[PDB]
Design a protein around this ligand. Structure first.
Ligand SMILES: CCCCCCCCCCCCCCCCCC(=O)OC[C@H](COP(=O)([O-])OCC(O)COP(=O)([O-])OC[C@@H](COC(=O)CCCCCCCCCCCCCCCCC)OC(=O)CCCCCCCCCCCCCCCCC)OC(=O)CCCCCCCCCCCCCCCCC
Ligand SMILES: CCCCCCCCCCCCCCCCCC(=O)OC[C@H](COP(=O)([O-])OCC[N+](C)(C)C)OC(=O)CCCCCCCCCCCCCCCCC
Ligand SMILES: CCCCCCCCCCCCCCCCCC(=O)OC[C@H](COP(=O)([O-])OCC[N+](C)(C)C)OC(=O)CCCCCCCCCCCCCCCCC
Ligand SMILES: CCCCCCCCCCCCCCCCCC(=O)OC[C@H](COP(=O)(O)OCCN)OC(=O)CCCCCCCCCCCCCCCCC
Ligand SMILES: CCCCCCCCCCCCCCCCCC(=O)OC[C@H](COP(=O)(O)OCCN)OC(=O)CCCCCCCCCCCCCCCCC
Ligand SMILES: C/C=C(\C)[C@H](O)[C@H](C)/C=C(C)/C=C\C/C(C)=C/Cc1[nH]c(OC)c(OC)c(=O)c1C
Ligand code: SF4
Lengths: 105, 318, 98, 96, 68, 80, 171, 344, 154, 112, 115
């Protein structure tokens, strides 16, 4: 920060709930805990300009966990192809996806 | 079968409203050294139906200065909220089991104000607007105390669920721990619902029937039965919270019966109070309910925060 | 979720467009500010519930607190404006140019 | 009296929670193998669906990492019906 | 006289008693000799979804026991 | 000042009760011995799974089983 | 019921749009109330009860004061409803139509990534904890009393000092 | 105002920015900005006249929107990255919206239209605080995120602030607006270099404060608010013309005075990055910033204007107002260039 | 620098206090009319309101003006007596007592002891009538309605 | 007691089914009476009560009196007296009840 | 959907009831019955004019106290934390601060109305 009075005195008024992997009230993990932890543990000691390209894989995995865009694309593609095939009459959905399965437990 | 449940929850409440009107008139009569209705039925058990039918045969008033949209929509909202408030009520097993029932009640009532407050504006007239602003003042007065009272009371229950109060009161009532909170809750239920001595919105001698002076027919009837439904609701809330009846898992109808008894007692108490006292002033109500009730309310909230701790009586989260 | 976040951001933008593009009254501007507050609240709350970040859930209550204090002082200024000019209009406030 | 009663309630709660603790493992095991079953079913269907499109790995990931990333209610229950999708959401939120 | 108020009070009471006993018995009738389940936390919902999927019929209130 | 409080108990007894109850709420937690069992009871509640621990071979005080002698005996919560 | 959340979001957009067109503060407050209701409903749809209930309560208690004020200050002889102005009615209709056309446009230039009409309701809750307890909203807010006690003091100071500010502005 | 209220309000004013500095959460940052907002309005509206009501309403309504926009930026960052800090790999639209709202908070052009109005609508104090202390936290936001800002609008806004402040102060007979346009120009000089060694931004800030505070005191000593009122100073308190002259000629940056150091070193660090013609334009409009200061100091120190008959009463009586800090701040300005390497 | 637009611009005041057309005090007006149940019979009572508190009261009576005095001028002294019963219509016997006393004074005649005694008796009965009336109607207005029904039996 | 019969007052004329002209009607108070009768929503009835309202009464020949509410509102039932005993007004109210009992409206509608 | 159903049922009850109230009866409309009441006589002005409110400060502080309620209301969950001292002190501070503000307003005559 501008005036690191917290680091001066060792207190944490606000710098302990800065992100997701940070002390949820009872120990319930937020989603992308692992991804954010890994990104942050890569980007430590480094600052900025070097972390933005030496810790890019981990940030990209985090971004896909949180915003989760490529899985939307993947399922949308699978669904679109399925609808095309069912319209053409090529695909035949099974019982365990039409609503008739043997429940496991 | 859920729709049959809706029936068994809704139609008897409406008959209860209708006969509460009769009970009000007759109790006020006998307190006033007279007999109320005893003509139209054997002992006047048809006057409510007569009033309803006659009100729905009268021509409604659509004035010229009015805003017809809010005008027609306000009684709708009034009755809808009065009738949705009965939904989570555990008597003992509710129709809709919510985890934040008291917040549902609070928000529903704070929205029920807007029926008065939009009908008064839409009905373009003076006494109408007077009633609306008096409703604003009334709500400003009572809402804070209602919330903090209810907080302090449930601070020994452990949740906002209404059904947990039954187990909180398995061996005792919450009236002996909190009779002061119960007093103030009662008088805030009396300020809510616009019931005497805190009427101050249809104050026939100050205003000429505020927020209903331009309403004649079934709309006015809707406002009427909304009021007389909220009365029974608030008595039901007081007797679920403080006057906890006996659950007895094998005998739940016992809970329902004792609930009936206590709710009737507290409603008759509302009517009694109408008959006994004169009306407050809507600034004297503020002075009362800020300068006497809110200090003691905050002090007793501090007390009820301390009390689970220094007694090792912190309740459970389910 | 992306749909509703888009819609909520467009709602914020509409309320911002509103409070920028003035009309005669000022109360309407204050209400547009309240609407922006509300959309921001819902965005924060939905992000927190999605991510299951119960550590950030104290943020929207703070938003409501400070926004209501903002509304309070705005309404007090409105009381003063009416006591001066009488009619709430923002066109009467045109004497600091000179 | 309230003190003593809430004292007992905080013990009945201990009992209930301890039962929950004792039965967490069975539910966890069954949850695991059920999720894995559903994912294998999705995969065995995606294979026959997208057998024809030019460049498509059927069990491909969206992550550079290799560790277990638990799925979510849309990947799972994606190819399934609308009732299952609308009970995953809106199932607890809309009480029984 | 004051006992001429008890008719209206009686209708009122018979009408206020029904919403409770009716809800209780409807719950017992649909769910079957059982109180309607409360699911205040996700764990209870998990238990009920489980018991649904155990039944063979999509009903959480059959209570399969030690016959399995 | 005793006379002042004597006057205030007659005129304006609502604020006297309020200040009394405020000070009582602040002072009584300092007094009781039961005040400390509250945190202990809130701690005892197992909302989350007690995750087991690997036997390093140097965990004597840690039990090998639920109903062993070791660990925090919750009998202080019984017969409190 | 898969388009539930999208309908709620669209209704909220329309409420805030009719707000931004600025009729008298009566109908503006009506719009605030309806939009806060819708906000509560979607916050519940995403698994949050407390936050929605509190938006509803706060905005109701606020629009009460707005009514009390606008009857005194922001009142005219003719309060200018939405229909009062042909131009406002036209911009309202045009705004609905424009947002509909915009949604149908961005559902084309990107198959998915901003809006998914095709898969709608499939991406709401994102990894619920199917087995859980002591997990609702309210624990996180109650952390204002433990592990986030600076939010509590700073908010309390805002309110406290706001009282003095009110008195001074009004005096 | 009773003392309890003054304690509360000045504590809040002091704690707004202090929370803004000593906070890593952007949301507590926003909280501090809102304390600065809330607590200023009582003392703006203290004298209770239409001018004060208008000033307070304009301030409030302009700052609320900027606050909401900053909160939007923060919430969009939280959605994007699940954190409460503007990292790298954020969206330039978020960062630029933050910059726009912060410029509206400061008073930069083309968001400058409210500052001279508001400043004229309020006393000399509450112009000092508004122009000095309220600028410090909004600047702290930018200083904390300087390697993330786009180096294009950051400079267009600076250039617009320079030009418009110069041109506006060219024709203002009112002094409370001259100070405002000076603020606009100096914030322009700051914001231009803020992506380039932000230590110099704080340098210009400190220099600007040290120049403006004693100038406001000078105006306070006789409640001078006009060229004609400051011109009647060769009779009332004529021992101040020396310091007023040197302070104005430091504000309009002339070399031997330390008010040229910030412009000089800014031009240095801008020519070290091939930002040449922008610096040329800025340096050439600072001259017009100097012109009206020169006109003013003609009017008050070099070409003594007519006075009145009733100004002899002021000569009979005595004064106590110079707080002993006017001297220190006026002499540490105007005479501290040879110590510039220790300032940088 | 004098533009065309800044030509009408006037320099501000020295104390930052502009002279204004102080807004007219447009108090609100209300007919607390005759149908109103608190209007004790017929009473227009135009009153001005700055909210819900009264800045001016102008009672426009004239709604039970018949012309009793002119009709009395046209009637005899006995024919005119029931007008006095009908003037104050909750204290009837006292009004006719006053009229009777006046006509007796004009006649230089006194009534006997028994008549005077029953006259004062019924005068005090009228006092109890009107005091019941006043007290209980005042209470009705204020909100307390049971004294009315308790005392109207008496 | 009137509430025994279902006859309770309401202050607003729009929540009212009947008006009882219990007093003297003056030239200054007649517009108000007619405004009130108008504002009453139909079905609506009028009871003239007392000689001063049936006819002009004891103030028939005066300059400020209308010589009957017949000229301003249509009266359904006339109650005589100065004053009429409340016994008598009650008789007249029950006579108005009997009048309502024989309205035969839907009958004639069917016979249109 | 149970709750949605209950509310729709109540809604439709109210609307059917209003439909009956409007389209069942008979109508005889004319301008002298559809104009505002004002007790027999005519209004001297419109009701859409300023109604000076004399408790506005009380309204604003009610808003702030509403926020205080919103801050106090998480306590039933705050009590099942392990600390039970920080929450105690912080709730004490919040309530005491609110009471101090109420006392300042009271003494400065903010709860009194603007005569
Ligand atoms: C250069 C800026 C020039 C601005 C022009 C100001 C001006 O018009 O002069 C006032 C002039 C009015 O004439 P006046 O009425 O005789 O002045 C009354 C004095 O204030 C009467 O003052 P007094 O009666 O109280 O006593 C005389 C007073 C007379 O002293 C003064 O009032 C002004 C002296 C300033 C000298 C600066 C010369 C430049 C030095 C270069 C370094 O004090 C002294 O004796 C001077 C002591 C030695 C100098 C102290 C100055 C220290 C500050 C140094 C700043 C240097 C900046 C450069 O016009
Ligand atoms: C409202 C919430 C915000 C939603 C966006 C606005 C969409 C509705 C606007 C329709 C235009 C209404 C208007 O112009 O004012 C007319 C009216 C004023 O009526 P009026 O005073 O002009 O009287 C009209 C007289 N007649 C009937 C003879 C033509 O005001 C309203 O409609 C506002 C009421 C709320 C509208 C929402 C209705 C929802 C339906 C629930 C039942
Ligand atoms: C449980 C209690 C709650 C009940 C609430 C609901 C009320 C139910 C009412 C049931 C009775 C229905 C009859 C209402 C008739 C009211 C209208 C009326 O009488 O006017 C004569 C009307 C109109 O007849 P008309 O055409 O001769 O009117 C003549 C018009 N003028 C006056 C101009 C000459 O007769 C009818 O229309 C009767 C048929 C309507 C039945 C609809 C049901
Ligand atoms: C003329 C028009 C008049 C319209 C009037 C409208 C009246 C609205 C009534 C007031 C409602 C305000 C309160 C909000 C609803 C209650 C919220 C709630 O807490 O319960 C919702 C319930 C789940 O909530 P919860 O109990 O916390 O979770 C249980 C988990 N087993 O289940 C849910 O999440 C679904 C709740 C849906 C609420 C439906 C609202 C209907 C609006 C229709 C209009
Ligand atoms: C930039 C483009 C500007 C185009 C100007 C269009 C005119 C206009 O309506 O905007 C001004 C309007 C202020 O309204 P007003 O000053 O009262 O104008 C007279 C209307 N009777 O401003 C407003 O009332 C606010 C309108 C906000 C628009 C919301 C709808 C957006 C979707 C279309
Ligand atoms: C539960 C029942 C209720 C609340 C009813 O409203 C009450 C019981 C009935 C009333 C009030 C009857 C008649 C109305 C009326 C407006 C009379 C005129 C009047 N009123 C007076 O005083 C009040 C007088 O005072 C001397 C009068 O001279 C005159 C002429
Ligand atoms: S009692 Fe006689 S004088 Fe009085 S109003 Fe009736 S008829 Fe007229």
């Amino acid at each position: 920060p501008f005036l690191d009075i917290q680091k001066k005195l060792g207190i944490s008024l606000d710098r302990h709930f800065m992100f997701l992997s940070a002390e949820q009230p009872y120990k319930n993990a937020a989603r992308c805990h692992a991804f954010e932890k890994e990104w942050i543990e890569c980007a430590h000691g480094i600052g900025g300009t070097r972390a933005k390209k030496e810790c890019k894989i981990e940030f990209d995995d985090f971004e896909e966990c949180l915003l989760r865009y490529k899985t939307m694309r993947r399922m949308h593609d699978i669904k679109k192809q399925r609808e095309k095939l069912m319209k053409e009459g090529k695909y035949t959905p099974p019982p365990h996806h039409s609503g008739r399965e043997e429940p496991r437990p | 079968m859920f729709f049959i449940n809706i029936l068994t929850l809704l139609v008897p409440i409406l008959i209860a409203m209708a006969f509460l009107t009769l009970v009000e008139r007759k109790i006020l009569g006998y307190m006033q050294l007279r007999k109320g209705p005893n003509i139209v039925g054997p002992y006047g058990i048809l006057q409510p139906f007569a009033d309803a039918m006659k009100l729905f045969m009268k021509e409604p008033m659509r004035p010229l200065t009015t805003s017809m949209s809010l005008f027609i929509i306000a009684p709708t909202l009034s009755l809808t909220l009065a009738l949705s408030l009965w939904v989570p009520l555990p008597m003992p097993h509710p129709l809709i089991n919510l985890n934040l029932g008291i917040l549902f009640i609070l928000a529903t009532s704070s929205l029920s104000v807007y029926s008065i407050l939009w009908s008064g504006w839409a009905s373009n007239s003076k006494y109408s607007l007077f009633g609306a602003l008096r409703a604003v003042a009334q709500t400003i007065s009572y809402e804070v105390t209602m919330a903090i009272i209810l907080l302090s009371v449930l601070l020994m229950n452990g949740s906002y669920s209404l059904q947990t109060l039954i187990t909180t009161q398995e061996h005792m009532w919450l009236l002996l721990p909190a009779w002061p909170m119960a007093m103030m809750w009662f008088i805030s239920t009396l300020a809510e619902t616009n019931r005497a001595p805190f009427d101050l919105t249809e104050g026939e001698s100050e205003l000429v029937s505020g927020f209903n002076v331009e309403y004649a027919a079934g709309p006015f009837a809707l406002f009427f039965m909304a009021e007389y439904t909220n009365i029974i609701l608030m008595n039901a809330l007081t007797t679920i919270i403080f006057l906890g009846p006996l659950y007895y898992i094998n005998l739940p109808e016992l809970y329902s019966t004792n609930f009936m008894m206590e709710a009737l007692l507290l409603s008759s108490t509302f009517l009694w109070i109408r008959a006994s006292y004169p009306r407050f002033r809507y600034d004297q109500l503020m002075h009362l309910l800020w300068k006497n009730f809110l200090p003691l309310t905050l002090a007793l909230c501090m007390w009820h925060i301390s009390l689970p701790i220094f007694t090792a009586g912190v309740p459970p989260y389910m | 979720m992306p749909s509703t976040f888009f819609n909520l951001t467009m709602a914020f933008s509409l309320s911002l467009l509103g409070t920028l593009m003035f009309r005669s009254h000022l109360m309407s501007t204050l209400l547009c500010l309240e609407g922006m507050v509300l959309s921001l609240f819902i965005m924060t709350s939905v992000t927190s519930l999605n991510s299951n970040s119960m550590s950030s859930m104290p943020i929207p209550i703070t938003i409501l607190v400070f926004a209501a204090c903002e509304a309070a002082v705005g309404l007090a200024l409105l009381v003063k404006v009416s006591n001066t000019y009488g009619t709430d209009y923002v066109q009467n406030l045109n004497l600091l140019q000179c | 009296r309230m003190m003593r009663w809430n004292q007992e309630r905080r013990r009945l709660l201990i009992e209930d929670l301890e039962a929950r603790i004792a039965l967490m493992p069975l539910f966890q095991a069954e949850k695991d193998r059920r999720t894995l079953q559903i994912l294998r079913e999705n995969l065995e269907e995606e294979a026959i669906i997208m057998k024809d499109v030019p460049n498509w790995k059927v069990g491909e990931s969206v992550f550079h990492t290799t560790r277990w990333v638990p799925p979510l209610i849309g990947e799972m229950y994606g190819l399934r019906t609308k009732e299952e999708m609308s009970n995953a959401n809106f199932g607890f939120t809309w009480y029984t | 006289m004051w006992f001429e108020i008890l008719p209206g009070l009686a209708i009122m009471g018979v009408c206020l008693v029904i919403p409770g006993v009716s809800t209780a018995y409807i719950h017992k009738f649909t769910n079957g000799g059982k109180e309607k389940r409360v699911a205040r936390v996700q764990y209870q919902w998990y238990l009920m979804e489980r018991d649904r999927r155990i039944s063979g019929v999509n009903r959480y209130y059959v209570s399969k026991g030690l016959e399995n | 000042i005793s006379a002042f409080l004597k006057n205030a108990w007659a005129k304006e007894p609502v604020l006297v009760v309020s200040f009394s109850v405020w000070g009582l709420a602040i002072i009584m937690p300092m007094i009781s011995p039961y005040t400390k069992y509250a945190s202990m009871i809130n701690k005892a509640t197992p909302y989350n799974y007690p995750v087991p621990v690997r036997d390093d071979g140097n965990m004597p005080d840690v039990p090998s089983h639920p109903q062993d002698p070791l660990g925090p005996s919750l009998d202080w919560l019984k017969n409190l | 019921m898969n388009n539930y959340i999208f309908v709620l979001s669209s209704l909220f957009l329309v409420g805030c749009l009719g707000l931004a067109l600025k009729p008298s503060p009566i109908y503006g407050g009506l719009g605030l109330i309806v939009s806060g209701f819708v906000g509560c409903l979607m916050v519940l749809g995403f698994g949050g009860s407390f936050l929605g209930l509190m938006v509803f309560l706060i905005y109701l208690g606020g629009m009460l004061v707005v009514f009390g004020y606008t009857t005194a200050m922001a009142t005219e002889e003719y309060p200018e409803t939405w229909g009062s102005n042909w131009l406002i009615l036209g911009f309202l209709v045009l705004g609905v139509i424009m947002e509909v056309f915009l949604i149908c446009v961005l559902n084309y230039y990107d198959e998915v990534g901003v809006i998914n009409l095709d898969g709608l309701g499939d991406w709401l809750m994102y990894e619920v904890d199917d087995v859980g307890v002591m997990l609702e909203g309210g624990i996180g807010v109650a952390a204002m009393y433990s592990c986030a006690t600076w939010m509590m003091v700073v908010a309390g100071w805002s309110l406290f000092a706001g009282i003095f500010i009110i008195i001074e502005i009004t005096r | 105002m009773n003392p309890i209220t003054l304690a509360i309000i000045y504590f809040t004013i002091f704690l707004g920015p202090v929370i803004t500095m000593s906070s890593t959460n952007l949301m507590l940052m926003w909280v501090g900005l809102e304390f600065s907002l809330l607590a200023i309005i009582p003392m703006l509206i203290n004298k209770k006249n239409p001018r004060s009501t208008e000033a307070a309403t304009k301030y409030f309504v302009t700052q609320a929107t900027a606050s909401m926009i900053i909160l939007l930026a923060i919430v969009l960052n939280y959605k994007q990255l699940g954190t409460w800090m503007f990292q790298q790999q954020t969206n330039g639209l978020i960062l630029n919206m933050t910059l726009m709202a912060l410029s509206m908070k400061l008073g930069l052009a083309p968001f400058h239209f409210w500052l001279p109005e508001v400043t004229q609508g309020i006393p000399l104090h509450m112009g000092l605080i508004l122009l000095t202390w309220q600028k410090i936290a909004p600047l702290s936001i930018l200083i904390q995120i300087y390697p993330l800002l786009n180096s294009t609008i950051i400079l267009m806004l600076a250039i617009t602030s320079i030009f418009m402040g110069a041109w506006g102060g060219l024709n203002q007979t009112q002094m409370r607006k001259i100070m405002a346009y000076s603020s606009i120009a100096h914030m322009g000089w700051m914001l231009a270099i803020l992506p380039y060694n932000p230590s110099l931004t704080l340098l210009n800030l400190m220099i600007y404060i040290i120049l403006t505070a004693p100038m406001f005191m000078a105006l306070m000593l006789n409640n001078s608010m006009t060229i004609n009122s400051i011109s009647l100073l060769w009779n009332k308190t004529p021992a101040m013309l020396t310091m007023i002259s040197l302070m104005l000629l430091s504000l309009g940056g002339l070399p031997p005075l330390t008010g040229f150091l910030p412009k000089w070193i800014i031009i240095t660090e801008l020519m070290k990055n091939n930002c040449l013609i922008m610096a040329t334009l800025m340096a050439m409009m600072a001259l017009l910033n100097l012109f009206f200061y020169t006109r003013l100091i003609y009017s008050t120190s070099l070409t003594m204007f007519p006075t009145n008959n009733n100004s002899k009463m002021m000569t009979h009586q005595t004064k106590t107002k110079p707080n002993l800090m006017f001297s220190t701040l006026a002499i540490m300005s105007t005479m501290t260039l040879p110590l510039a390497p220790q300032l940088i | 620098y004098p533009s065309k637009e800044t030509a009408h611009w006037k320099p501000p005041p020295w104390n930052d206090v502009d002279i204004l057309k102080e807004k007219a005090v447009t108090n609100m007006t209300l007919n607390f009319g005759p149908q109103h149940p608190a209007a004790h019979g017929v009473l227009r009572l135009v009153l001005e309101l700055s909210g819900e508190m009264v800045r001016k009261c102008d009672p426009h009576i004239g709604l039970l003006h018949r012309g009793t005095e002119k009709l009395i001028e046209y009637k005899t002294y006995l024919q005119a007596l029931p007008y006095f019963d009908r003037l104050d219509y909750v204290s009837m016997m006292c009004n006719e007592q006053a009229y009777s006393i006046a006509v007796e004074k004009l006649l230089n005649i006194q009534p006997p002891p028994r008549a005077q005694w029953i006259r004062v008796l019924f005068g005090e009965i009228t006092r109890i009538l009107n005091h019941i009336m006043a007290v209980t109607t005042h209470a009705l207005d204020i909100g307390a309605m049971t004294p009315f029904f308790w005392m109207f039996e008496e | 007691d009137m509430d025994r019969f279902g006859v309770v007052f309401r202050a607003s004329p729009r929540q009212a089914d009947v008006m009882i002209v219990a007093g003297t009607l003056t030239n200054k108070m007649a517009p108000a009476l007619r405004k009130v009768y108008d504002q009453m929503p139909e079905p609506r009835y009028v009871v003239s009560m007392g000689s001063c309202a049936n006819g002009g009464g004891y103030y028939h020949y005066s300059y400020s009196v209308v010589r009957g509410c017949d000229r301003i509102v249509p009266v359904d039932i006339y109650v005589p007296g100065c004053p009429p005993t409340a016994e008598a007004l009650l008789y007249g109210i029950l006579q108005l009840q009997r009048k309502i009992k024989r309205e035969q409206k839907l009958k004639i509608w069917y016979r249109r | 959907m149970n709750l949605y159903t209950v509310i729709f049922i109540n809604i439709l009850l109210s609307l059917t009831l209003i439909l009956v109230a409007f389209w069942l009866p008979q109508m005889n409309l004319y301008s002298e019955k559809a104009n505002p009441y004002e007790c027999g006589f005519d209004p001297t002005s419109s009701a859409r004019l300023p109604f000076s409110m004399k408790f506005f400060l009380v309204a604003i502080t009610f808003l702030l106290f509403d926020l205080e309620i919103a801050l106090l209301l998480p306590l039933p969950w705050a009590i099942q934390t392990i600390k039970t001292s920080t929450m105690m002190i912080m709730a004490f501070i919040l309530v005491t601060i609110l009471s101090l503000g109420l006392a300042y307003e009271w003494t400065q005559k903010g709860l009194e109305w603007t005569e």
